[PDB]
Amino acid sequence: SMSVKKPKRDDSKDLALCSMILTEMETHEDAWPFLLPVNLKLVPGYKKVIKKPMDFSTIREKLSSGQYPNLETFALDVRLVFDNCETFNEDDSDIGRAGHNMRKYFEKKWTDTFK
Numbered sequence: 001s002m003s004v005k006k007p008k009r010d011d012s013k014d015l016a017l018c019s020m021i022l023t024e025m026e027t028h029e030d031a032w033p034f035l036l037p038v039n040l041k042l043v044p045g046y047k048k049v050i051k052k053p054m055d056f057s058t059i060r061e062k063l064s065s066g067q068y069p070n071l072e073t074f075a076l077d078v079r080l081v082f083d084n085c086e087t088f089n090e091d092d093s094d095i096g097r098a099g100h101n102m103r104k105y106f107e108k109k110w111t112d113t114f115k
């Protein structure tokens with residue numbers, strides 16, 4: 001409260017570390033569905049069903065231009081990619097499986113790096 005502050009974690013390396021995690025995700029062999037925005041003109045249903053599209057290139061641009069105020073807003077956008085994937089794809093499809101694999105991969109990096 002006013003004039004009563006918690007010790008807070010050193011956040012000075014957060015930007016660099018999120019960038020490293022994102023690089024590791026960008027170079028994963030199962031990242032291919034998620035590298036660019038889904039083409040809303042070519043994929044029926046996507047625009048109407050998925051209210052907030054997100055992809056790795058869009059996260060990279062936001063990270064490079066100061067659009068994440070903190071590391072938690074970064075994690076929310078990463079998770080959004082995989083939540084969107086689960087919404088639109090059957091678990092037992094190539095894309096569906098890719099999404100589960102990448103979510104697992106991300107969450108371990110996240111825990112190992114920050115928790």
Ligand SMILES: Oc1ccnc2ccccc12
Nearest residue numbers: 033034038043085088089
């Ligand atoms: O949900 C998706 C994620 C990435 N790519 C996709 C390509 C076509 C149809 C759905 C997709």
